[PDB]
Amino acid sequence: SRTAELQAEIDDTVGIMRD
Amino acid sequence: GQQIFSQALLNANRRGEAKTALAEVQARHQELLKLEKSMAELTQ
Amino acid sequence: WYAQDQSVALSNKCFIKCADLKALDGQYIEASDIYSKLIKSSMGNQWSLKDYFLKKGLCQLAATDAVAAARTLQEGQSEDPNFADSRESNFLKSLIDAVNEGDSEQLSEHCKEFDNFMRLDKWKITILNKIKESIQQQEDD
Amino acid sequence: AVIRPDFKFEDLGVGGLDKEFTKIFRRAFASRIFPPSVIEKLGISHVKGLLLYGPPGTGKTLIARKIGTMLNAKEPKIVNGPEILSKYVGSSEENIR
Ligand SMILES: Nc1ncnc2c1ncn2[C@@H]1O[C@H](COP(=O)(O)OP(=O)(O)O)[C@@H](O)[C@H]1O
């Protein structure tokens, strides 16, 4: 569960940096 | 009136040391590879 | 001009375009030299760096200079730990090994293996095909 | 089918044991020569097990080695006895089945 949460946070940050 | 020796068999039970887990680690590796790829895009 | 302006970043964007086009035009040595500049400007600043190491080595292989490719691999493995443990380093090693053995099939296998995990862009495909052709030409010769 | 059309047993190395060969051929592969229809019409089942034994160094392993190639048989599967056993639980029984 920790790794999936980390993946989710990284995907969100990728979105923010793309913006 | 008799003594005896002793001989080993098995490591765990149903599962064996050759393939101990052999899934809980492989799929995780796939998760970690996904993590690495996403980090690649984020840092870029 | 960007390097004179201390704009390392724009200079690198331009030198990437320059090295890529030079390599596609068969000027593999000069492209490798520009990649060496990109590496040096990027050291201590890493993802692009791995790509730079890989591309440098690929140019050297296309120049049929497997020794320079092996030196580039060793350099990258010593100077940047992320290249040391990267797929790009392992791939460059496998390509150097296949070139030294003259096995164009093993090179094609390693290319497919790499492509399954990290898609080869058109540039890498072109350079890898040139390397394969140089192996096959040595086999045919 | 079960025996190669090109074979006469004169070429094969095993010599000095001819009666045993005839007995084996008669009692082992004889039932698998005709078309199947006769056997069920006659109510006879096939043989399943064959046992060879003798003193050390009489030629049995030679027969086993050459029978596969001599009689147009599927490549026989050869396993040494003590190679079946294994460490993990259930591995051996799996290996047999
Ligand atoms: N007709 C024969 N009878 C016995 N041995 C033979 C015969 N022809 C050849 N040999 C030789 O004798 C050996 C056969 O012995 P083998 O059957 O392997 O011993 P074991 O009976 O312990 O398996 C081989 O070296 C083989 O070349």
CB contact under 8 A, B17 and D88: yes
The CB of D12 under 6 Å from ligand 1? The reply is no
Q: How far apart are CA D27 and CA D46, in angstroms?
A: 10
Find the angle CA(C93)-CA(C101)-CA(C67) to the nearest 5 degrees.
55
- Count CA within 13 A, CB hemisphere, residue C68: 16
Q: How far apart are CA D34 and CA D72, in angstroms?
A: 16
Alpha helices in C6-121 (DSSP H): 8-24, 28-42, 47-62, 66-79, 81-84, 87-101, 104-117
Alpha-carbon dihedral of residues C38, C39, C40, C45, nearest 10 degrees? 100
C-alpha pair distances (Å), C17 with each of C5, C23, C24, C29: 19, 10, 11, 15
Residue A7: its chain B contacts at CB < 8 A? 31, 34-35, 38
Task: Please report the resolution in angstroms.
Answer: 4.3
Closest-CA distance, B27 to chain A, in angstroms, reads 12
Q: How far apart are CA D44 and CA D33, in angstroms?
A: 14
Q: List, as one string, the DSSP characters of B18-38.
A: GGSSSSTTHHHHHHHHHHHHH
Q: How far apart are CA C52 and CA C73, in angstroms?
A: 11
Q: How far apart are CA D71 and CA D5, in angstroms?
A: 9
The CB of D5 under 6 Å from ligand 1? The reply is no
| Structure-solving method | cryo-EM
DSSP C119: P
